[PDB]
RNA sequence: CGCUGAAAGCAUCUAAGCGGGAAGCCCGCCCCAAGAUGAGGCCUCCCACGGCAGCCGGUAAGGACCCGGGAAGACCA
RNA sequence: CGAUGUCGGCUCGUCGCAUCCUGGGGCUGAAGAAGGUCCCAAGGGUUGGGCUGUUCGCCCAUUAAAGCGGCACGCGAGCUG
């Protein structure tokens, strides 16, 4: 089950077959594996993935020791793709073709402490007619004496954003050996320069 | 099949099983399928 | 003349294979073990009960047709949240809490009662990794 | 929904 | 009025070793194994098998009539074997041998494939017949029913799949 | 809805056994989660310093404070 | 009764199933298509508008369907009045 770590770019649309199809450009190579999960050691298969390259200096000791192990260059960020054995020490974007399917997970933006309406799509209240300064707020939360308490799970105001999404089913338009790149149809999750993961699709 | 808490033979055909803690009546007639409940 | 109080005694490891037992057969008397009421010692207001390992746990047996009607319980506190898990598959995905549930239910119920469970160890399987403490193979 | 309407109990309230 | 009593006669030359709470059969066309309750007793006579019962109570009454048969049964398959037939009725209905496999045509806009499961031999002697061999009575009823359902008779005609003796008894339209 | 099948010489989906069968149930999909006190696992770094399962002082790996900020954000994080 | 705010609407739902639809069936006076009738099933879904304070109902135009009930005839320290 193969996968890759990125970073969002930014979205364009590009032209084919008289189509125009609405594309984000995600920076996914190279990743170099260094650390392998396995069912004795571990308990569960999958590969430690490391991405973006870093100034020594700001990499501690405990760190060092980690890389060094592995043969690697210190790196920004290590996420694993599980269930995966690349038989290299490093992936690219090789691995995905033109028009396979995939999925990708990204940190989505933050809209901070959101209200309901943005939050959940509640309805708000009317805005004339009477209405009393509720004209975003909830309306009733309950019953009365039964249950005589709230449920759990009430949607409510509170942060929203800032949280891990993945968006799934996604076409693989190009992709350039040349540059890393690689072109997915759709939307990701996240603002550019965000970090994302890429994987090859759950759907059938 | 009929449901219905009175299940009695119906013609001469019909017979009364028993089966998985119900009573049910089949028969070669169709109709006369029947099961209590 | 006051009644004898125990100095902390040394608590005895003790080993029962539940192969083919009853489950609530098996159950109380492992409580009354736990509790360590087969001492002549017992004080009911500190931990001196023994250990117990049980080994065979998914080997368990139980009378009627409890094994598809059995049915075990667990609400989340959401709307809706009220799971349902039949004996049978109890046995297929988790079986040492077969055992583990029966004896906790029989356990007094405060601070004291949640401990003695804790004093409880119960495995699916031949084995158990509790060499060290080289248990006493019981009969029950 | 009960078909016979049902009295006020309480009138509504004021700053008397 | 009593099957469990009534004595297995078994052709020479098949075995029957006893065993606990089960049975072994081997003869020509190949083995079974019966399971049978601990509380019936099998017993190996010269030429012949006989069952007996521990009491009267109505369970024994109950296990000992099926003990019989379902050894007789087991008897019966590996010397002689089992088989049923099944005819195609209907207009563009057909059938034939697709490898080892059998070939269902009957009105789908698809053909029909069924695969012979282990120890089930399919045979296709006409368009409109089938036959399904093998020496497990218990299977072969299965797999026979299994493609009687594929394509069960109209109500209305003469259409579908038949068992071979199956009468046709069908309802007026209009 | 069956297969095989007694009791009950026949019949029976059942009393022994075996099939097929729902947008429903269990899993699978996405998100949270070891305060899961039953507090899990792996990789890697630190070291057995002084004075009197303890206290006190200085440190190690490391961390916090402070500062420039941030599609992170009420403060906090 | 030294106070348990009362219809309807809005808002937000959650539950029951005696199921309106969608799924699985038996019987049919089931040719096909389409219905009737009972059984299983609460996962999801179950529209917009005219009249009236209305709930309900009637009507217009659609619909797979335009389900019925409980939660102080849910919900006024949430709004309307
Ligand atoms: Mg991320
Ligand atoms: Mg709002
Ligand atoms: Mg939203
Ligand atoms: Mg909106
Ligand atoms: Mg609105
Ligand atoms: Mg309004
Ligand atoms: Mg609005
Ligand atoms: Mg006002
Ligand atoms: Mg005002
Ligand atoms: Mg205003
Ligand atoms: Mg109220
Ligand atoms: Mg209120
Ligand atoms: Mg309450
Ligand atoms: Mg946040
Ligand atoms: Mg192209
Ligand atoms: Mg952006
Ligand atoms: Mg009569
Ligand atoms: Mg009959
Ligand atoms: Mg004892
Ligand atoms: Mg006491
Ligand atoms: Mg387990
Ligand atoms: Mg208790
Ligand atoms: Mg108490
Ligand atoms: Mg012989
Ligand atoms: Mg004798
Ligand atoms: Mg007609
Ligand atoms: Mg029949
Ligand atoms: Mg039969
Ligand atoms: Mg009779
Ligand atoms: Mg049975
Ligand atoms: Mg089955
Ligand atoms: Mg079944
Ligand atoms: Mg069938
Ligand atoms: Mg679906
Ligand atoms: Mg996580
Ligand atoms: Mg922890
Ligand atoms: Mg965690
Ligand atoms: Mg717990
Ligand atoms: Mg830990
Ligand atoms: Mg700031
Ligand atoms: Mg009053
Ligand atoms: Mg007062
Ligand atoms: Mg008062
Ligand atoms: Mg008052
Ligand atoms: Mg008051
Ligand atoms: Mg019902
Ligand atoms: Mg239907
Ligand atoms: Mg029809
Ligand atoms: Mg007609
Ligand atoms: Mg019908
Ligand atoms: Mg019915
Ligand atoms: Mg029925
Ligand atoms: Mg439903
Ligand atoms: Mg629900
Ligand atoms: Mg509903
Ligand atoms: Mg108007
Ligand atoms: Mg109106
Ligand atoms: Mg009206
Ligand atoms: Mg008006
Ligand atoms: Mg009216
Ligand atoms: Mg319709
Ligand atoms: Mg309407
Ligand atoms: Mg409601
Ligand atoms: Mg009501
Ligand atoms: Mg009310
Ligand atoms: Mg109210
Ligand atoms: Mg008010
Ligand atoms: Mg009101
Ligand atoms: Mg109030
Ligand atoms: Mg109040
Ligand atoms: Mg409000
Ligand atoms: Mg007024
Ligand atoms: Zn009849």
Redesign the interface.
């Given at each position: 089950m193969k996968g890759i770590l990125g970073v969002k770019v930014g979205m364009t649309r590009i032209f084919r077959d008289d189509r125009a199809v609405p594309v984000t450009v995600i920076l996914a190579g190279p990743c170099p594996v260094v650390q392998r999960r396995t069912p004795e050691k571990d308990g569960y298969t999958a590969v430690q993935l490391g991405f973006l390259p870093q100034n020594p200096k700001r990499v501690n000791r405990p760190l060092k020791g980690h890389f060094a192990k592995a043969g690697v260059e210190p790196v920004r960020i290590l996420r694993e793709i599980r269930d995966f054995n690349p038989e290299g020490d490093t992936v690219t974007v090789e691995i995905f073709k033109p028009g396979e399917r995939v999925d990708v997970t990204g940190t989505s933006k933050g809209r901070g402490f959101a209200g309901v309406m943005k939050r959940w799509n509640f309805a708000g209240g009317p805005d004339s007619h009477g209405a009393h300064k509720i004209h975003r707020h909830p309306g009733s939360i309950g019953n009365r004496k039964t249950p005589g308490r709230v449920?759990?799970?009430k949607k409510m105001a509170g942060h929203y954003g800032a949280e891990r999404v993945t968006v799934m089913n996604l076409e693989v338009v190009d992709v350039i050996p040349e540059e890393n790149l690689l072109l997915v149809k759709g939307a990701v999750p996240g603002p550019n320069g965000g970090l994302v993961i890429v994987r090859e699709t759950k759907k059938a | 099949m009929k449901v219905r808490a009175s299940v009695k033979r119906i013609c001469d055909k019909c017979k009364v099983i028993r089966r998985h803690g119900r009573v049910y009546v089949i028969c070669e007639n169709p109709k006369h399928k029947q099961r209590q409940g | 003349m006051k009644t004898y109080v125990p100095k902390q005694v040394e608590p005895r490891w003790v080993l029962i294979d539940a192969e083919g037992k009853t489950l609530g057969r098996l159950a109380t008397k492992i409580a009354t073990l736990l509790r360590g009421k087969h001492r002549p010692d017992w004080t009911p207001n500190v931990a001196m009960g023994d250990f117990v390992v049980v080994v065979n746990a998914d080997k368990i047996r139980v009378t009627g047709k409890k094994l598809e009607q059995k049915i075990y319980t667990r609400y989340?506190?959401?709307?809706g949240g009220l799971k349902k898990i039949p004996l049978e598959k109890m046995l297929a995905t988790h079986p040492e809490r077969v055992l583990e549930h029966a004896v906790k239910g029989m356990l007094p119920k405060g601070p004291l009662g949640r401990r003695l469970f804790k004093r409880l160890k119960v495995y699916a399987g031949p084995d158990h990794p509790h060499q060290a403490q080289r248990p006493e193979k019981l009969e029950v | 929904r009960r078909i016979r309407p049902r009295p006020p109990r309480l009138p509504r309230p004021r700053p008397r | 009025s009593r099957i469990g009593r009534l004595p297995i006669p078994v052709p020479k030359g098949v075995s029957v070793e006893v065993a606990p709470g089960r049975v072994k059969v081997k003869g020509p066309k190949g083995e079974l194994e019966v399971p049978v309750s601990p509380e019936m007793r099998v017993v190996v006579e010269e030429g012949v098998v006989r069952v007996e019962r521990p009491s009267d109570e109505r369970r024994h009454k109950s296990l000992h009539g099926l003990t019989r048969t379902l050894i007789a049964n087991a008897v019966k398959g590996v010397s002689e074997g089992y088989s049923k037939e099944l005819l195609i009725k209907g207009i563009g209905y057909r059938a034939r041998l697709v490898g080892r496999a059998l070939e269902l045509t009957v009105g789908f806009s698809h053909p029909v494939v069924v695969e012979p499961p282990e120890g089930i031999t399919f045979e296709v002697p006409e368009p409109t017949r089938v036959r399904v061999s093998g020496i497990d009575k218990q299977k072969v009823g299965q797999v026979a029913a299994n493609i009687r359902a594929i394509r069960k008779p109209s109500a209305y005609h003469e259409k579908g799949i038949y068992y071979a003796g199956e009468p046709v008894r069908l309802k007026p339209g209009k």
């Open positions: 449920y759990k799970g | - | 989340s506190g959401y709307p | - | -």
